Symmetry: D2
Subunit: 123 residues, 4 copies
C-alpha cells in the first residue's frame, strides 16, 4: 500500500499525568447483518498510548463498528475510582469510500473526550 | 433543588448554544445481563433534560445513557462521525446520590462529564 | 437571569464543581490596554454568579483569567499550565448572555461558550 | 519517545481532520515581566508543527503558545467566539523535558492537553 499499514488506529491519553495511557484494553466489534455485534478485534495500547496492527484494509470492510475501551481497569490499578465503566465509540466506516481512521480518547477520572481524524489515503 | 437523581445537560461546540431536542435514552442492566429501558426524553431549549427518574425509582445498578447525537447533526445538514454518544456507569452503589451527565457535541468529537452531587443530611 | 457574563468551572478529577477558583475579568480599553473589569472566585456550585450588569457590560473585547495553578496546587497537585485564559469579543452583534464553561484536569483543560439571548 | 523538544498539534473537531496552516507564535517571559518572541510557524498538512526550538535554546522559564484560531475559522467563512487560544506553561524546571501541546478546535470551544516526557537517554 502507501505509507501507513493499518486503517484503524486508536490513541489514548492521560490528562491527570500528561502521558500516554499504556495497557488500556481496547476491543472492536462489528454490527453483523442481524444487528448483532461480531468480535472484530482486540488489542492493548502500547507504551505510546497507541494501538497498531488492529486490522488490514481488506478485513476492515464497510459497516458499523464499536470500539470499547476499558477505562475502569486503567484507573483502578492506579488507586483512583472512576465514574465510567468504559469508553465506547460507535461509528460507520468506509461508507464514503476506503479511507484511514484515527480514534483519539483523552482520559480523566470523571470525563473523557473522543475525536476522529478521518483521512483519505489517496486524496 | 435536585428533585431527580438523573439530569442530562447537552451543548453544541460549533454554535455556542445548548443542543435542543437531542434524543436521550437511559437503559438499566438486568439481573440476567440484559438492558431494559429505564427512561427516555429529549433535551429542552436550554440543553437540559430532567425528570427522567425519581429517587424512589432510580436505584442501584449499572446504567447506560444514550444520546442520539447523529440525528441531531443531520437536522443541521451535517454528516457526523458517531452514530451516537454513550455513557455507561454504575449508579448509586455507594448509597443514594444525584448525578449530572454533561455532554459537549461536535461533528467529529465529544466529551462527557460526571458531576456527582452528595445529598443533604 | 440578570447576569450577562457568567463563568462555570468543573473539576474532572474529583467529578464535582471547581470551588475557590479565582477569576479576574478584564476589558480592553480604547487605549489598547487591559483595564481590570471584574473579579471573584467560584462559589460552591462552581459558578460565579454576578460578575457584572447589563449596563456596565458594554461592547468590546474581554479577557477572562482562571487561576487553575493555585487551584491545583492547594490540593497538592503540580499542574501544567500557569492558568487558563479566554479572550473574546462581546456584544459586537447584539446584547446577549455569555457563559464561559471550563472543565479542569492537571495537564488539560477545556473551555466552551454558550451565547444565549434575552427572550421576553 | 518524542524527538522534538516542543511540538504543537492542532485538530478540527468539525471536519474531523488536521487543522492545517494554523499560525503559532511562541513567547518567553523576560526577567522583568516582558514577553519576548521565541519562535513561530504554521501547522503542516499533518496538523502538527515541527522545528520550534532545540534543547539548547529551550531554557527554563515560562512560555506561552499563541494559536491564531480566529484566522483559521474566518478563512472557512465561519465567525469564531475566541480571538485566539493561549497555552501558558512553565518549562524545564524539574529537569529538561520534551513537550507536546495538543489543541482540539471548534468555533465556540477548544480543549488543549499537554504531554511531557523525559528526553531519550
Ligand atoms: C457548560 C456546562 C458544562 C460543560 C462544560 C465543558 Br468545557 C465541558 O467539556 C463539558 Br463535557 C460540560 O457542564 C455543566 C455541568 C452541569 C451543569 O449544571 C451545567 C453545565 C454547563 O453549563
Ligand atoms: C487527537 C490528539 C489529541 C487530543 C485528543 C482529544 Br479527544 C482532546 O480532547 C485533546 Br485536548 C487532544 O492529543 C494529542 C496529544 C499529543 C499527540 O502527539 C497527539 C495527539 C492527538 O492526536
Amino acid at each position: 500500500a502507501g505509507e501507513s499499514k493499518c486503517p484503524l488506529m486508536v490513541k489514548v491519553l492521560d490528562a491527570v499525568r500528561g502521558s500516554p495511557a499504556v495497557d488500556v484494553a481496547v476491543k472492536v466489534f462489528k454490527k453483523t447483518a442481524d444487528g448483532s455485534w461480531e468480535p472484530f478485534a482486540s488489542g492493548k495500547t502500547a507504551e505510546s498510548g497507541e494501538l497498531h496492527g488492529l486490522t488490514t484494509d481488506e478485513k476492515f470492510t464497510e459497516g458499523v463498528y464499536r470500539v470499547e475501551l476499558d477505562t475502569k481497569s486503567y484507573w483502578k490499578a492506579l488507586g483512583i475510582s472512576p465514574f465510567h465503566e468504559y469508553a465506547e465509540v460507535v461509528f460507520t466506516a468506509n461508507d464514503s469510500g476506503h479511507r484511514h481512521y484515527t480514534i483519539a480518547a483523552l482520559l480523566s477520572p470523571y470525563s473523557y473526550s473522543t475525536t476522529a481524524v478521518v483521512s483519505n489515503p489517496q486524496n
